[PDB]
């Protein structure tokens, strides 16, 4: 199988800056590299094939060039249509295999996420479960770090995150966690503890509730 | 133009087999080769299998040797994926890709939308919701954040809505992706709410509602 390798992995980028994302191969594939663009929800257009001939209608902003083991894919000037995920595919052999995608983001200024936490409703603590929600607002860039803190105590395994696509009116993000717990184990702590440790933050703030005291 | 269609996906447990179909048309469907490629929930892209336009050779992922079966009827104009065996592990949308030119190395040039297969032993179902108000309440900002949690569903295919008391939708929403939990959904949804008095006075709650194939459904969420 031949293993193909993207990088970057994500790339924060402005209209008019020059793209480039790489891929390369665990064997020589000789040229026959493709490049798929992929918009959320959409399905994969092809922009690249043989490393470097342009598929009929892609914008000759788009070129690739490479061979053997290293390609790449450069958009000359970033429009706003450009900012998708990236694929590149070796043709070569079969099992035909496809990197692990390129995201192309809009940049942005830094944001700090407006931290929230909700306590499980009392219906859902009657029925057996708890969930503790901790939501991040509006931040940027993307990496922040959500850590769940039960009566000062690090929680991991129990905890599930959910970022949501780069918001098309300001280019941040918004994370969910969710600390799900069996409503036994739930009563016999107080403290419920959201660490968020940002970027943008000199601080991790934490958010938290004792239960019971809303 | 040349439009590729898939259908067959649905909700299915482990063990269990499935069919997919892709219709072809715009283009000479027997004078090209067909391909399947799948894309797990928030994953990349991950190619499935392969025939040729004569249907002589047909080349499969390690992962669905012998388990999926890859064929078409020319006269139809149709691509078929038999898919047996199911595991958790095939759940994504599945997209038929046609090939640019006869040469072994053609890239896809036409993809279809797709088809979501999702395989859970869990059974398919509508969402359990329940409101997420904030403790003590978001006093200290210029909006209150109330939330809606809906969970326990099946497959993934949700959409939040939200009413104010007075019947009207609510613009301050945030949607936020599912996670998996144990074969079943959950996802949240959030709004944002003007604290600076109008908070709530007369509103004593809004409405959060969630479409799902297996049934909508709605809750009462606090002010």
């Known amino acids: 199988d031949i293993q193909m390798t993207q990088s970057p992995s994500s790339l924060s980028a402005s209209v008019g800056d020059r793209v480039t994302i790489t891929c390369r191969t665990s064997?020589?594939?000789?040229?026959?590299l493709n490049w798929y663009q992929q918009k959320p929800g959409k399905a994969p257009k092809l922009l690249i094939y043989?490393?470097?001939s342009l598929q009929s209608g892609v914008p000759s902003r788009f070129s690739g060039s490479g061979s053997g083991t290293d390609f790449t894919l450069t958009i000359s000037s970033l429009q706003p249509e450009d900012f998708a995920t990236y694929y590149c595919?070796?043709?070569?052999?079969?099992?035909?295999?496809f990197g692990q995608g390129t995201k192309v983001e809009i940049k942005r200024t830094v944001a700090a996420p407006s931290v929230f936490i909700f306590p499980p409703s009392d219906e859902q603590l009657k029925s057996g479960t708890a969930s503790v929600v901790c939501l991040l607002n509006n931040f940027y860039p993307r990496e922040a770090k959500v850590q769940w803190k039960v009566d000062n105590a690090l929680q991991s395994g129990n905890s599930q995150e959910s970022v949501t696509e780069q918001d098309s009116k300001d280019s941040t993000y918004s994370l969910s966690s969710t600390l799900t717990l069996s409503k036994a184990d739930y009563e016999k702590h107080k403290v419920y503890a959201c660490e968020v440790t940002h970027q943008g933050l000199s601080s991790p703030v934490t958010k938290s509730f004792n239960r019971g005291e809303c | 133009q040349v439009q590729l269609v898939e259908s067959g996906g649905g909700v299915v447990q482990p063990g269990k087999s499935l069919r997919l179909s892709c219709a072809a048309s715009?283009?000479?469907?027997?004078?090209?080769?067909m391909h399947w490629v799948r894309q797990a929930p928030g994953k990349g892209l991950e190619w499935v299998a392969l025939?040729?336009?004569?249907?002589?050779?047909?080349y499969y992922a390690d992962s669905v040797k012998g388990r999926f079966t890859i064929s078409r009827d020319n006269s139809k104009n149709t691509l078929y994926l038999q898919m047996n065996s199911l595991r958790a592990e095939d759940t994504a949308v599945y997209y038929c890709?046609?090939?640019?030119?006869?040469?072994?190395?053609?890239?896809?040039?036409?993809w279809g939308q797709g088809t979501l297969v999702t395989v859970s032993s869990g059974s398919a179902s509508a969402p359990t919701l329940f409101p997420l108000v904030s403790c003590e309440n978001s006093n200290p900002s210029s909006t209150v954040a109330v939330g809606c949690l809906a969970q326990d569903f099946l497959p993934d295919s949700i959409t939040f809505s939200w009413k104010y008391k007075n019947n009207s939708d609510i613009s301050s929403t945030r949607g936020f992706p599912s996670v998996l939990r144990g074969g079943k959904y959950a996802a949240t949804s959030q709004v944002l709410l003007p604290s600076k008095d109008v908070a709530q006075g007369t509103n004593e709650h809004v409405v959060c509602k969630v479409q799902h194939p297996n049934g909508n459904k709605e809750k009462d969420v606090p002010l």
């Open positions: 043989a490393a470097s």
């Open positions: 595919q070796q043709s070569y052999s079969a099992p035909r295999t």
């Open positions: 025939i040729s336009y004569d249907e002589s050779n047909k």
């Open positions: 890709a046609k090939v640019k030119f006869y040469d072994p190395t053609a890239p896809n040039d036409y």
């Open positions: 064997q020589s594939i000789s040229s026959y």
């Open positions: 715009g283009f000479t469907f027997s004078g090209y080769g």
